[PDB]
Structure formats: structure tokens, C-alpha cells
Design a binder for this molecule. Structure first.
Ligand SMILES: [Mg+2]
Length: 1308
RNA sequence: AGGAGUAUCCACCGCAAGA
RNA sequence: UUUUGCGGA
RNA sequence: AGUCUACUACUA
RNA sequence: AGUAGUAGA
RNA sequence: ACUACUA
């Protein structure tokens, strides 16, 4: 039953009125929103901003720090070993007890070194001892720490403690003294970092990346200093645990030259913590800025630079731990981009310099530098394009205090690069090296690489927790000023065309023209009414009568907001928690429409929370309560069903199929430009006009904040759908009316922050005055970011189509190709303008005749008519309250940017660096296989977006190395299988500490799971043809794995579970600490799950069962883990605990991975072939193409061309038929028919499961336990960036990858 | 002494004894 | 308010 | 630490 | 289907 | 929660 709500009634809008208004608008002269990019213009902007910047911030004489960890290296760095640490620590204490301290941060260092050196032999055993092999000492109370009482500190040493436990300024960048001294300092640091310290791919990578990047880089001090900072950060991470951070610690590296004195500090496990330490080092080539050193002690002409007490956040500490890995990935990406750009291998100097710059950026994890880089990814598109908002973007570049010599150096390099880029409008000077590029894609990829070298969240704890609110507040106030000025009815119901003509200031953001909105809906209807039947089928497909809280979105773990608490703030709860609350407080499971009926009068409460980004300004997103979610879900379902049917709307596309859609749009764009347009004169003369394209990489200034939800109300009421009634349309209009006003709550952090201030600044006072109650405030028309993405995107497409119709009406003589692609706010406008093919004596005469006849709008179309189209569009969109951004919107004849992917003509390029640098993120500590599979599969995505197979293989190697280093499993560590097993590392099953198929092409095409099967087959052949001991040992290892699994295939093919082998780690998952977890006793959940086995695969559609199902979900250990607010260190500690601690299940007891490996070795030594286990192996046994392929290296330089995106069908409802298999009850049957897309043929797809399993594994899935095991394997098309010549089939992509194994060489 | 900043923030919590 | 000793984050 | 759009792994 | 990771708006 | 042969 769809309710009867108010339906808005047509205004009778006529395109004639809008085309007449557009004629009047284009008749006059319009100031272009953008400025032409000229070298003189950019240089003058830089000079004027330099002159003005001296007054912005108080002058700074002393530059602040830029290096989080300072250290120097003169000899090759051997990475730390426990023996080397203790030898180097003793040597370093002997070194630095000779020096004479002067500063308190030198006396503390000397007094901690003297304490450490006075630790007994027993102290040195527990020191550097694993936690399981550690004892209390009364001087070494933790594995890597030692006590240091104040009783053991000099008078000045305790003064350093007093400073720690007891006014923004900018360097004068206008002066040449600072721009010389700061650049000279970094040029000395970078040059020191550049100093040299005294499968098919495995071969190709060895000759290409290793000989030309990882080897060239291997000798530099940047490489060894990166290893030294890995070991420093490993010590700091080891010191940041809850119990180890209370005490001090001394560690040393590079034969005692580098010493790390980790002071007591708050454990990084808890938030708002910093790992305070002092690093002392002999002054030499490296990350040293002697102006920012605490001391430089002298002894025998030797300089010992004592660094300041550097407090480092957990995010920054983990950044510095992967600083070498991030720098190496960035340099490999730059290396590949250089190879594609110039066709030549980068020179040694260029690679060393770019690695030094990348490593300095990875070390200097500063939000100031991160912000400047964030502005440079906007500045480079601005100063490269034809017209852009480069003056305003450069103004943004100077709205920052340059407080450190790196920011001054980075700014100076930015200024030089931007001025040089504006000279040409190919050639593209590099930001990190001297070599100039040829493709803008390489430069933009380079600067995005620099930007992504800064980890997300490098912002202030509360400085940027407040800044998210102000951006929302002002537009919630600008709306109020707009409402007061225009009457609160013009703003909400919308102004008419005659009002706009009378005022002409109404064409402003947050104000929408009613006639324009209706006409945009009409132009969208011109497409919709063609497929009205499909539109109606799509709308009624959505979950309108299907129950709420049965869709995964309404029961997910994503946070939502509850109600206003007694404190007055908005309660921060989980989506599932609110689902369970409403289900408990209701006697039935409501549908979407019924829940909207019951929850339409509540207000759309909301709360904003920071999405921890790397942007200069953190973009916090809103969290909506349950009624707001149901309103927005009604609107988004309606406008996703409607939007899926039109092609110029892109948020409705699927993932990377948006890239294919925009690629096809651009292909048709240059297809139209491939021609000469003809204008028909009264004499019938055909003026020939050269068709040209202008790509506007449009960005919307404050799309969600500063818009009007009300524009959609007249949109929905006029957007036609094939539905007979207007019942659903009226419901959607009502929902849009209910999302007009929002209760914007500021976070508890911000409220306590403001409530902990002695005085309130005037701008803070203005910000707080927005909320009338201390916490709540009113937001009008500003639909929260991302909540109406579908609806707003479709509205933008409609307004662009309306402008297209208006332009067609205005100039029917000119055939102009028009292609708009709105995703949500990012948009790409291709405007086809007919430039006069000659000097234009005819064209100018024709335009003059048109103007004289009465078409005054033709003044606009003579010179550069694309400007006229963009102006008219920027206006039409403004009539729909859409402001194309003056800055971050760039027009260009050739280059375009959409969805953070850069197009050049027919070519596309997505920067895969983000995937590669993001592949070094946290891991699931499930186990060694789960962690190795996650690490190795994160780079396959990059291989798809453009990554070179080597650069992806190198990333896989780095990820695998990190994962091993957290799990032993490294050669010469503790859990290395080769120590206890009798096979090589490559010939070891992944569960038993195996690297597996490290090759990316196997992981890209086959999968990680197939490495165990690929091993089994590789064993089976060895035990089927040669009958050697190695493959028999491998089979014994696999059989031991199955013995651990305790699953039984019994008679060949006729058993209980399907297995390949696994190991069971001691996963400690606590009990749920949430409100709706004790409602039903866990025993009741046990009986309920054992009876209703169908619901393990389909969400129940009845409130009575759904309550029990959701209570069970709250008690799921994985779900409990996902909602306990853990930290990335406790995760790292948990992975590392699987090195020495009793974390593995062997037999019936918990043993270490050492003992599991030993038991596996014993079993595989004693294993004997039963001729039935071989039958099991045959069943358990895309890789055919990979093992049967070969390539020939032609002596010719590899050619590079346009890159496109193509689909990839690697493998040929899946989770609901199993529910029908166990469907025993009437309610379960109803739920399984509701969940199934086509319930009629359920058994038809069940018989395929019976036949498919019997064909492959020969198992009787009719048994309950058997079917549950085959479900995970039953459940298991991507989109890749290839070259233009490559075909869109599965094998062609692999052929291209094989051809791309080399980088400067050719492969046939 | 750091991190963050033309938004006041983080940089350790409790206990018992002694000065 | 400093320290010492004991625990927790 | 949200909404969509996905991709990749891993788990019943 | 659930989690983890990543990317885009 | 570490310190291996560290891609
Ligand atoms: Mg854009």
C-alpha cells in the first residue's frame, strides 16, 4: 500500500521563455569565470601573492623542523639483528660517554647511555628477548626497555624531562635570503640522500627494475637510511605498546653510529599518543638539518648530532616504518612512468634524485607539506590547461604559513614548475628531477605520487575536527541570509523565470529556477519516456514492498546516529544496533514504504565525522539517523532506478565501468570532431567550419553544502516514469521534502573543545552562534554530502541536457556536439565548437548578419564560441543551484580529468600509485595465509589500472616481505619453514609458512588460493611420473594439513567436508559489549542456528526470526571484532605474536608455529602413500596458459601509445539456492523465495549444484554438513588498463601483460 | 623538545609512602 | 608540587 | 569514521 | 552473505 | 610485538 502524499503540480514551463532569456543573456558581454594560462600571468600571480604574504603571518627567523626522524649514514647499513643491536648499543654507549653534554637533551642522552651500559649480564638477556622467553629483572622489565629512575639522571637531564611533561609563524618566502637558505639546506639533504655509500618476469624484473632501479637505489644513502629508519621505527613500534612505553629504551644501529633513546611516553595503542625519542648520530650525509638539531657534540673532530625530542604519532610512526617501502614504490612508479613517457630507462642521477625526494617526503610526514602537495595536484592541471582558476588556486597556495625549510624549498620548486608549465600551452618539467616530460599524465602521476606518500590523517586532532563543521555552517548560514532576503518561499519552492529576469541576482547558488527545474525534468523525460517500461520495471524492482532491515545496508555495521542523548549530543551507534532496536520495538518487519510512513515526522538528525583523508582540509561526512536513512533510501532507490536508464549519468554505472562509459563518450566526441561542419546560408552557401573540442574537467563549488534539496521535489514531480499511478513519485517527493531540514549536531569532541577554552575568538563565536542549542543546529536545503548522490547527479545531468536543448534552440544553424558526464559533482563537459576554418571573413560576415537580423545572441558565438557555451552552461547549472567551480575546473582542448582519471584524446590513465601505496596498509591478522593472501592480492588491482608487471611484482615482494617480517617466515628468522622442513621456500604450502607463487601474473590471473592447488598438482606429477622424495614430502605436508583440519572425505569423493588443508591460529575474539547481544541467550542462538540452517545464507524477512538473526550477527566473532574500535599497532602486535607465542592449534593443544612446523616435518617424513589419499589429491587438483607461454625479446625500443580500459572475464542467485536447500519451514520457504531473484527455477539451479559438485568433487551436497563446506568455494569480471591495440577478451589482456613484462624492450 | 595551527589541542592515568 | 615503590591504559 | 559505486582477498 | 584493504565522488 | 639471508 503506497500512501497518498501531496504531489507538486506543473508550472507550465516553456523552453521558449528560457531560450529568450538565454538570448538576452548571451546578447551582452560575459566575464569568463576562468583566466587564460600564460607564463607572465602565473609569474605575476606568484609575485603579487609573495608581496602580500609578508603581512599574512608573523615573520619567522628560525625555520621549524621538517624531519620527523633525523639520522646520518657514512657506511653501508646492515639491518639490525638482536646480536647487532646489543653489540652496537654497547659500542654506542662507549662512544657517547666520552662526549661532553651541554644541552639538557644531551645530558639526558648521556645519563641514559650511562644507565644502559650499567646493566648486568642478566639484564642483557631479558633485553632483546621475546615476550615468551622473558623474565622480570628490576632493570629490564620489558623485552626491549629498561627502567631509568630520576635518581639515575643529572640535574640538567631532569630539566629535559620538565620541558616535556610540564602564534603560527611563516618564513618570509618573499625574501631571497630564506628562499636561498631553505633551498640550500634541502639541496644539501637531498644531495646527501643521493650520495652513494661505499618466472618470465623474475628474469625481466632482474634486468629492468633491479638493474635499473633497485640496484641504482641500493648503493645510495637514501636506501640504507631508509633501512635504518625501518629499524628505528621497528624499535619505536616495539616501544609503543601499553606496557613497554612506561619505561625507557636504548637501541643502536650502524655499528653504534646511530643511537635511539626512546623516552617514556603514552602508548601509541591509545589515541592521542606520541612516541617521544631522541636519535643521536655522527654527523654525515643523510637526513640531517644542523639548524634543527638539539646539539652537535664535539669529540676528537667527530661531530655527534643529537636530535631534538621528536614526538611522533602512531600514524606518522607507521608511515616512517613503511617510509622506505613507500619511497621505493613511489620511485618504481616514477621509473615506469618515465619509461612510458620517454621510451628510455631513467638515468642514474634522475633515479637517485627522485628516490631521495620520495624518501624525504616519506620521512617528512608533515600535514603542511601534505597540504601543499594537495594544492599542487590542483595547481598542475590549472597551469597546464588553456583556461583555469589558476590565480585563485595560487592564492590558495599562499594561504598557508611556510614554517619549515622543506615547505619553502617545496614552494620554490612549485613556483618554478608552475611558471615553466605556463610557458607552453609536449613538454612538462618534472617536480622531482631535471628531466622534462612529454605527457601531462606522467607529471600529474608524479605529483599524485608525492601527495599519496603522505598518509591519510596527518591532520591535527581537533584543529581539523572543527574545520569540517565550518564548511557546513557557513552554507547553512548563507541559506539563512538567502531565505531572509528572498522570503523563504522563493528559496524553497523556487523562483520563476520572470523573477530571475527582474532580479538577475537570483542565478546564484542555493537558489533554483522553478521553470529551469521543470524544463530540465522535461529534457530528461525526452529520454525517459522512450523507455518508460524499463524505467517502471527498474523502479518497482527496488525495495519498496520488500522488508526493511532485510537489505544488507540496513543491517550493516557502518555507523549511524541514534537519538539525542541526555547530554544533548547525537548518539553514535551502529546501523545494525538501530535496526535491532526498531525491530524489538515493533511487532512486524516493516517495508521501506511502511517504515517511511512510521518514520516521516521525526526530523532528519545528523552528525559529521572526519573521513581521515590526505587532503589539505579534511572532508568530514555526515552520519544520519534511521528515519533520515529511510528517506534517503527511498529517494536514492527512486533516483537510481531512474538514473540507470540514461547514459549521461555516471554514478549509476558500475565501479570502473564508469571509465568505459566516459571512454566511449570521448571516443564519440573525437569521432564527431573528425569532420567538417557546414553552415547553411540563405543563398545555400555551405560555410565550412573546423570542428574542435573543448573538454571542461568541471568541478562543482560545494556541491552538497550550498545546494537545494527542493530542486529535486519539482524534479521528481516532473520526472516521468512508466508507473501508472503517481503514488511512488508522491512518496519520493514527500521524502525529499522531509530531507529539506536537518538537525546538524556537532561532535562531542568539538563541543568539549570549545567548552574547554578560556576565551572564544570572534570567528569561533560566529561559528557557535549557528547552533541555537549548545549542540544542535538547523541546516536547510543543504542535503548532506553523498546522501543524494544519485538524485543530485541525475539532476545535474538533466540541467546539462536542458542547456543542450537551449543551445540547440538558440543556434540551430551550428551543429555543435555536446557530451556531458556528471558523476556526482565531478563532471566532464565536451563542447563541440565550430572554429572558422579560415581567417573567418565569411563566418564573421554571417555572424554580423545574424546580429543585424535580430539574433543579438550571436555576438557570443563569433570569437571562441566554446566560451559562450560554457558561460550559458555555467548559468543554466546555476539556475539549478549548481556552481561550476572557478578553481579546480579546467578547460582544455586536449586534456580532461574525470573521476580522478586523466584523459588525453582517446587515451585514459588512472594513477595506480594510490593502489600501490595503499597496498602497504594494515592487514587482517587472521593468520599467515589470510595475511599473505591479502598482501599479495592488493597489487593485482594495480596490475589492472596500469601498473607495470615488475612494479606490481616489486610491490608484491615488498608486501610479502613485510608480512613475513611480522610472522617470522623470513629466512634466518624463527618461523622459516626451511629451518624445520626439507623443501625450499617456493615449494612450501602457504598455510605452512609458504611464500607461494610470488609472481604477480599468477596472482593476477589465477588467484592466491590456487597456489596450494598449484602446489598439489606440482607435487602430484612428481609422485605420478618420477616418484621422488620431495613431492612425497609435499604430499605428506598437505595430508598433515588435512589432519589438522579434522575434515573427512572418507571414501574417495564420499565424505563430510571439502578440504585442501589449513592451520588454526588462536583467534581471541571477545564477547560483544553491545546492548542487543544479551537479549537472547547464546544457547538459544546455538539451537536456532543449528535448526534454521537456511538463514546462514539468506537474511530472514520476518521480524521474529530477523531479531534472532541480528542478535546472532552481533555475537559473531568477526562482527564483534569489527565494532570494538581497535588500533593499527594492537593489530601489528597480534600478527607479530604468531612468531614466538603459542598461537597455533596442533592436536588438542596450543603450540607455537615452531612446533607446528616441526610436527609437519615429522608427519611428512613418516608419510606413506595410501593410494586413497592420492585419490583425494586427484580431486583437489587458470594456470594452463601461464605454464604454456613463451616470449622473444626483439632488439627494438618498446612503442607506447594510447591506453584504454577493457573488461576482463577471469572466471565464469549464488548465495540463496543453498538457503532453499535447507529451507524446511514455511517461514524459511517464504524468505528464500523472497530473497531469490527468480524463485521459480530454484531447484533448477539446485540441480546444477548437485551435478556440478558431483562432476568436480563427487560429494553428496544433500547432507547438511557437506553443503556448508562447499558454500565458501562455490561463492568464489574486473576492468583493466591495456593499450589500444589490445582486444577486450580474457586472453588478450594476459598477452598484453606478457608483452609488458619488459619496459624499454619489445616482446612478440 | 616535537605533532597540528593565522581554532585555544595532543604530548599518561590511578594508588601508597616520604619531602 | 617533586620523587620512590606498586598497577592500569 | 557516513552514502553510493565498485574491485580484491579471506571466512561460514 | 560477513570482515579486512584500497580507489572514486 | 620484533630484530633474519630485510625485494
Ligand atoms: Mg573534476
Amino acid at each position: 500500500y503506497i500512501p497518498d502524499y501531496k504531489g507538486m503540480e506543473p508550472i507550465g514551463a516553456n523552453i521558449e521563455d528560457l531560450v529568450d532569456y538565454s538570448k538576452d543573456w548571451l546578447s551582452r558581454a560575459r566575464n569568463f569565470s576562468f583566466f587564460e594560462v600564460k607564463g607572465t600571468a602565473v609569474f605575476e600571480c606568484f609575485n603579487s601573492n609573495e608581496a602580500n604574504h609578508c603581512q599574512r603571518y608573523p615573520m619567522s627567523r628560525k625555520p621549524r623542523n621538517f624531519l620527523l626522524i633525523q639520522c646520518s649514514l657514512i657506511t653501508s647499513y646492515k639491518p639490525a639483528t638482536t646480536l647487532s643491536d646489543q653489540i652496537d648499543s654497547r659500542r654506542a654507549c662507549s662512544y657517547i660517554l666520552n662526549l661532553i653534554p651541554d644541552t639538557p637533551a644531551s645530558y639526558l642522552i648521556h645519563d641514559m647511555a650511562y644507565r644502559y651500559i650499567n646493566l648486568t649480564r642478566e639484564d642483557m638477556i631479558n633485553y632483546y628477548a621475546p615476550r615468551i622467553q622473558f623474565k622480570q629483572t628490576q632493570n629490564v622489565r620489558e623485552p626491549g626497555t629498561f627502567k631509568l629512575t630520576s635518581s639515575m639522571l643529572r640535574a640538567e637531564s631532569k630539566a629535559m624531562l620538565d620541558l616535556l611533561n610540564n602564534q603560527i609563524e611563516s618564513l618570509n618566502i618573499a625574501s631571497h635570503i630564506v628562499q636561498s637558505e631553505s633551498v640550500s639546506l634541502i639541496t644539501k639533504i637531498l644531495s646527501d640522500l643521493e650520495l652513494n655509500i661505499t618466472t618470465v618476469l623474475d628474469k625481466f624484473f632482474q634486468n629492468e627494475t633491479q638493474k635499473y632501479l633497485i640496484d641504482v637505489l641500493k648503493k645510495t644513502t637514501a636506501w640504507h637510511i631508509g633501512h635504518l629508519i625501518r629499524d628505528i621505527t621497528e624499535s619505536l613500534i616495539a616501544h609503543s605498546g601499553l606496557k613497554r612505553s612506561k619505561y625507557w629504551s636504548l637501541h643502536s644501529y650502524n655499528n653504534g653510529n646511530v643511537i635511539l633513546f626512546i623516552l617514556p611516553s603514552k602508548s601509541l595503542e591509545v589515541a592521542g599518543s606520541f612516541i617521544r625519542f631522541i636519535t643521536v648520530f655522527r654527523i654525515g650525509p643523510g637526513l640531517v638539518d644542523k639548524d634543527n638539531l638539539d646539539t652537535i657534540l664535539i669529540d676528537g673532530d667527530s661531530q655527534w648530532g643529537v636530535s631534538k625530542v621528536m614526538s611522533i604519532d602512531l600514524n606518522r610512526l607507521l608511515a616512517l616504518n613503511i617510509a622506505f617501502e613507500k619511497a621505493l614504490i613511489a620511485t618504481a612508479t616514477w621509473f615506469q612512468y618515465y619509461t612510458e613517457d620517454q621510451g628510455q630507462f631513467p638515468l642514474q642521477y634522475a633515479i637517485r634524485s627522485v628516490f631521495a625526494n620520495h624518501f624525504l617526503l616519506a620521512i617528512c610526514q608533515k600535514m603542511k607539506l601534505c597540504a601543499i602537495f594537495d594544492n599542487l595536484r590542483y595547481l598542475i592541471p590549472a597551469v597546464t590547461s588553456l583556461y583555469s582558476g589558476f590565480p585563485s588556486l595560487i592564492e590558495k597556495l599562499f594561504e598557508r604559513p611556510f614554517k619549515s625549510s622543506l615547505e619553502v624549498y617545496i614552494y620554490y620548486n612549485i613556483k618554478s614548475l608552475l611558471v615553466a608549465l605556463a610557458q607552453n600551452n609536449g613538454v612538462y618539467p618534472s617536480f622531482m628531477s631535471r628531466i622534462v616530460y612529454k605527457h601531462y599524465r606522467s607529471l600529474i602521476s608524479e605529483v599524485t605520487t608525492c601527495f599519496f606518500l603522505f598518509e591519510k590523517g596527518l591532520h591535527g586532532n581537533m584543529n581539523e575536527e572543527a574545520k569540517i563543521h565550518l564548511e557546513t555552517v557557513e552554507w547553512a548560514l548563507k541559506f539563512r541570509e538567502k531565505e531572509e532576503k528572498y522570503g523563504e518561499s522563493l528559496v524553497e519552492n523556487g523562483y520563476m523565470m520572470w523573477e530571475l529576469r527582474a532580479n538577475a541576482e537570483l542565478a546564484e547558488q542555493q537558489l533554483y529556477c522553478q521553470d529551469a527545474i521543470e524544463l530540465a525534468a522535461i529534457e530528461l523525460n525526452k529520454v525517459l519516456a522512450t523507455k518508460s517500461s524499463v524505467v517502471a520495471n527498474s523502479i518497482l524492482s527496488k525495495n519498496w514492498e520488500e522488508p526493511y532491515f532485510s537489505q544488507t545496508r540496513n543491517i550493516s555495521l557502518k555507523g549511524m546516529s541514534g537519538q539525542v542523548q541526555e547530554d544533548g549530543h547525537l548518539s553514535s551507534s551502529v546501523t545494525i544496533i538501530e535496526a535491532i532496536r526498531y525491530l524489538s520495538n515493533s511487532r512486524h518487519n516493516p517495508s521501506l514504504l511502511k517504515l517511511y510512513e512510521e518514520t516521516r515526522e521525526q526530523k532528519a538528525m545528523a552528525r559529521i565525522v572526519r573521513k581521515y583523508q590526505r587532503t589539505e582540509a579534511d572532508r568530514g561526512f555526515f552520519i544520519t539517523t534511521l528515519p533520515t536513512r529511510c528517506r534517503l533510501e527511498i529517494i536514492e532507490d527512486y533516483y537510481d532506478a531512474i538514473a540507470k536508464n540514461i547514459s549521461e549519468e555516471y554514478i549509476s554505472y558500475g565501479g570502473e565501468k564508469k571509465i568505459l562509459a566516459i571512454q566511449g563518450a570521448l571516443e564519440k566526441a573525437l569521432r564527431w570532431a573528425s569532420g567538417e561542419s557546414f553552415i547553411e546560408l540563405s543563398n545555400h552557401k555551405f560555410i565550412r567550419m573546423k570542428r574542435k573540442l573543448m573538454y571542461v574537467s568541471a568541478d562543482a563549488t560545494k556541491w552538497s553544502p550550498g545546494d537545494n534539496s527542493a530542486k529535486f521535489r519539482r524534479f521528481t514531480s516532473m520526472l516521468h516514469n512508466g508507473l501508472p499511478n503517481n503514488k511512488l513519485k508522491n512518496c519520493v517527493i514527500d521524502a525529499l521534502k522531509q530531507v529539506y531540514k536537518t538537525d546538524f549536531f556537532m561532535s562531542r569532541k568539538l563541543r568539549n573543545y570549545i567548552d574547554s577554552m578560556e576565551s572564544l575568538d570572534p570567528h569561533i563565536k560566529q561559528f557557535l552562534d549557528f547552533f541555537p542549542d549548545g549542540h544542535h543546529g538547523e541546516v536547510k536545503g543543504n542535503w548532506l554530502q553523498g546522501n543524494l548522490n544519485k538524485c543530485s547527479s541525475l539532476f545535474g545531468v538533466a540541467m546539462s541536457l536542458l542547456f543542450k536543448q537551449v543551445w540547440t534552440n538558440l543556434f540551430p544553424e551550428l551543429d555543435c556536439f555536446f557530451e556531458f558526464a556528471h558523476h556526482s559533482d565531478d563532471a566532464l563537459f565536451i563542447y563541440g565548437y565550430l572554429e572558422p576554418v579560415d581567417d573567418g571573413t565569411d563566418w564573421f560576415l554571417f555572424v554580423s548578419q545574424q546580429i543585424q537580423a535580430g539574433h543579438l545572441h550571436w555576438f557570443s558565438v563569433n570569437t571562441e564560441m566554446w566560451k559562450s557555451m560554457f558561460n550559458l552552461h555555467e548559468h543554466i547549472l546555476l539556475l539549478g543551484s549548481i556552481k561550476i567551480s572557478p578553481k579546480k575546473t579546467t578547460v582544455s582542448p586536449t586534456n580532461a580529468e574525470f573521476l580522478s582519471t586523466f584523459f588525453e584524446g582517446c587515451a585514459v590513465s588512472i594513477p595506480f600509485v594510490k593502489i600501490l601505496l595503499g597496498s602497504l596498509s594494515d592487514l587482517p591478522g587472521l593468520g599467515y595465509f589470510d595475511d599473505l593472501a591479502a598482501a599479495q592480492s592488493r597489487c593485482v588491482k594495480a596490475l589492472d589500472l596500469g601498473a607495470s608487471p615488475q612494479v606490481a611484482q616489486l610491490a608484491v615482494a615488498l608486501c610479502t616481505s613485510k608480512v613475513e617480517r611480522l610472522y617470522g617466515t623470513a629466512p634466518g628468522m624463527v618461523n622459516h619453514p626451511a629451518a624445520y622442513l626439507q623443501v625450499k621456500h617456493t615449494d612450501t604450502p602457504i598455510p605452512l609458512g609458504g611464500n607461494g607463487a610470488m609472481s604477480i601474473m599468477e596472482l593476477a590471473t589465477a588467484g592466491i588460493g590456487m597456489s596450494d592447488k598449484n602446489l598439489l598438482k606440482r607435487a602430484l606429477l612428481g609422485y605420478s611420473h618420477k616418484r621422488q622424495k620431495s613431492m612425497l614430502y609435499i604430499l605428506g605436508l598437505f595430508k598433515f594439513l588435512m589432519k589438522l583440519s579434522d575434515e573427512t572425505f572418507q571414501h574417495e569423493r564420499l565424505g563430510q567436508f571439502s578440504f585442501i588443508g589449513k592451520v588454526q591460529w588462536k583467534i581471541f575474539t571477545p564477547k560483544s559489549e553491545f546492548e542487543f547481544a544479551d537479549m537472547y541467550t547464546s544457547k538459544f542462538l546455538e539451537l536456532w542456528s543449528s535448526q534454521h540452517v537456511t538463514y546462514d545464507y539468506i537474511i530472514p524477512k520476518g521480524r521474529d526470526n530477523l531479531l534472532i538473526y541480528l542478535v546472532r550477527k552481533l555475537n559473531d566473532p568477526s562482527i564483534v571484532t569489527a565494532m570494538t574500535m581497535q588500533s593499527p599497532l594492537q593489530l601489528r602486535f597480534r600478527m607479530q605474536a604468531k612468531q614466538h607465542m603459542k598461537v597455533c592449534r596442533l592436536d588438542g593443544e596450543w603450540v607455537t608455529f615452531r612446533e607446528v612446523l616441526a610436527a609437519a616435518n615429522s608427519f611428512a617424513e613418516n608419510y606413506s602413500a595410501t593410494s586413497q589419499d592420492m585419490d583425494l589429491f586427484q580431486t583437489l587438483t587458470w594456470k594452463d596458459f601461464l605454464n604454456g607461454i613463451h616470449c622473444d625479446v626483439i632488439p627494438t625500443k618498446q612503442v607506447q601509445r594510447a591506453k584504454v580500459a577493457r573488461t576482463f572475464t577471469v572466471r565464469e542467485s549464488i548465495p540463496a539456492v543453498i538457503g532453499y536447500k535447507f529451507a524446511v519451514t514455511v517461514e524459511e520457504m517464504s524468505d528464500v523465495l523472497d530473497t531469490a531473484k527468480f524463485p521459480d527455477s530454484l531447484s533448477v539451479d539446485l540441480k546444477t549444484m548437485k551435478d556440478g559438485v558431483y562432476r568436480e568433487l563427487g560429494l553428496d551436497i544433500s547432507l547438511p554438513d557437506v553443503m556448508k563446506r562447499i558454500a565458501p568455494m562455490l561463492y568464489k569480471s574486473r576492468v583493466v588498463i591495456v593499450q589500444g591495440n589490445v582486444e577486450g577478451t580474457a586472453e588478450a589482456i594476459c598477452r598484453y601483460w606478457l608483452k609488458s613484462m619488459s619496459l624499454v624492450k619489445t616482446i612478440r
